[PDB]
Design a protein around this ligand. Sequence first.
Ligand SMILES: *[C@@H]1O[C@H](CO)[C@@H](O[C@@H]2O[C@H](CO)[C@@H](O[C@@H]3O[C@H](CO)[C@@H](O)[C@H](O)[C@@H]3O)[C@H](O)[C@H]2NC(C)=O)[C@H](O)[C@H]1NC(C)=O
Ligand SMILES: N=C(Cc1ccccc1)N[C@@H]1O[C@H](CO[C@@H]2OC[C@@H](O)[C@H](O)[C@H]2O)[C@@H](O)[C@H](O)[C@H]1O
Ligand SMILES: N=C(Cc1ccccc1)N[C@@H]1O[C@H](CO[C@@H]2OC[C@@H](O)[C@H](O)[C@H]2O)[C@@H](O)[C@H](O)[C@H]1O
Ligand SMILES: *[C@@H]1O[C@H](CO)[C@@H](O)[C@H](O)[C@H]1NC(C)=O
Length: 475
Amino acid sequence: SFNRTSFPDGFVFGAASSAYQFEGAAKEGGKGPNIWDTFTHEFPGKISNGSTGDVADDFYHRYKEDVKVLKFIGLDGFRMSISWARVLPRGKLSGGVNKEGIAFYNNVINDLLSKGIQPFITIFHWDLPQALEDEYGGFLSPHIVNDFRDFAELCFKEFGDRVKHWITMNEPWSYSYGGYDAGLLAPGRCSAFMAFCPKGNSGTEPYIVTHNLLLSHAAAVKLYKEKYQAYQKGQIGITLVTYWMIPYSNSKADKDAAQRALDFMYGWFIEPLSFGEYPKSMRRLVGKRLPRFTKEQAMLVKGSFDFLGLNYYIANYVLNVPTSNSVNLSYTTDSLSNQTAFRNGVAIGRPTGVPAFFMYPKGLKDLLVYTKEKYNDPVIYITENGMGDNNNVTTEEGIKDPQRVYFYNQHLLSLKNAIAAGVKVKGYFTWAFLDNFEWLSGYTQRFGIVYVDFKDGLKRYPKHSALWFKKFLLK
Ligand SMILES: *[C@@H]1O[C@H](CO)[C@@H](O[C@@H]2O[C@H](CO)[C@@H](O[C@@H]3O[C@H](CO)[C@@H](O)[C@H](O)[C@@H]3O)[C@H](O)[C@H]2NC(C)=O)[C@H](O)[C@H]1NC(C)=O
Ligand SMILES: N=C(Cc1ccccc1)N[C@@H]1O[C@H](CO[C@@H]2OC[C@@H](O)[C@H](O)[C@H]2O)[C@@H](O)[C@H](O)[C@H]1O
Ligand SMILES: N=C(Cc1ccccc1)N[C@@H]1O[C@H](CO[C@@H]2OC[C@@H](O)[C@H](O)[C@H]2O)[C@@H](O)[C@H](O)[C@H]1O
Ligand SMILES: *[C@@H]1O[C@H](CO)[C@@H](O)[C@H](O)[C@H]1NC(C)=O
């Protein structure tokens, strides 16, 4: 039966997590507030059922038993993130290191390694300390770069003797678009015409924030390369997300619109990372709302990754949107494109428990080949791939997830094809290890290969998908 021998020797199979979504202990162990503590508490209308990550999976206390589950499944690796405000409660290094926070991550890492599981560490997975958001508006300010750099350094110093795979940040697209265009994610900023956020500007701030995200990423990578990489002997990268874009029709209009959508979502980050400049379509359509890289900045950002982390979930069809005399000025409308999961009333693939998300495993290969061909054959890890179930059945029924078995069977076959096509994929991580706090969707969506019974003591039960992976891994 389909198993890991179909993949390169030493290929890393793992599961993924993030700190705010899993940890809980949000006000414990010396931890300071982050923007997600603030967002979920002050805007309960923006979270399904007014949920928070106050407790989440309580991974902070339950990590020892959870690591046993990872070993049971037989995973090679585990992707997890560092809570910035847990290790630096005041955000700045000068504000002091929280010894209790450092100890937790050390404990998790030491346990993982005893089970032969490699920790892949995301330094920043959106949970910015409130102190930094308060001081200078977080990623709206160039001040964020030095503080991000110091945070990265703390991680390298404290964990780098054991951690050999670093991811600077998770999905700066989501942080910028979600936090500053649509106002759906912390810090919850958007234009007043949306009547959805207290402050913001969806037409300017996402571009400001993305620039500082890239610069912060680049600062961390430069420091790692110059100061830690030679003796710790690890690798550092960044995780990007994009939908795969398919033109709605055969028209030139829809063809160009599809590429514009990809330019604005993916190219926004991977062209600076590869070429030191933003995509031409963005420069043309966004004009002077799009920051320029100085010569120093372009030099720092270009080539600043050892590997690319890619998160893949879905493909969408893309329609051209003609220019209009009625403008809502926003990153969203700047690309003159419209995404839809339906063509001629027919869904792009099998449904999931997430209304927008349909199964399109071919898109994983297409994205990987596109990336190989456009950006000089980079080393790639699939740092997230998964699907969600609606949280509307009993624990008993939730555990039986043949649809997720199917999902991973199909996507791993597609990944196999990408590797055969010469894409240098070295690893693959399931989102998620556990059912968790899924940001604006709260606990209404279950992405785990392991079920968490939120109603009954947060108990863990491996799903059929976990058992499928256990067999796939010959473990
Ligand atoms: C729990 O929530 C899920 C939501 O994902 C429910 O499953 C979904 O049910 C809808 C409506 O029954 C399905 O859509 C329909 O499918 C039929 C036949 O395939 C189609 O002809 C209709 O036009 C309509 O599109 C949807 O596919 C399905 N989603 C899945 C399975 O992922 C489920 O009913 C809920 N369960 C309980 C116990 O409330
Ligand atoms: N600020 C809190 C309350 C809190 C904490 C986590 C999540 C939500 C709400 N607690 C205090 O955070 C402090 C650090 O975080 C600072 O709290 C004061 C804020 O003005 C400042 O911006 C923040 O960095 C810790 O040093 C203290 O031990 C602790 O009592
Ligand atoms: N989900 C994203 C991208 C995103 C998230 C929110 C809004 C716009 C775009 N990326 C990855 O998807 C994973 C699943 O994301 C879910 O996708 C379905 C949404 O309805 C749900 O709210 C979201 O958490 C997240 O848990 C990871 O933390 C994240 O890295
Ligand atoms: C794993 O797959 C290979 C095909 O490459 C097959 O020869 C082998 O028997 C399989 N093993 C199991 C345990 O399924």
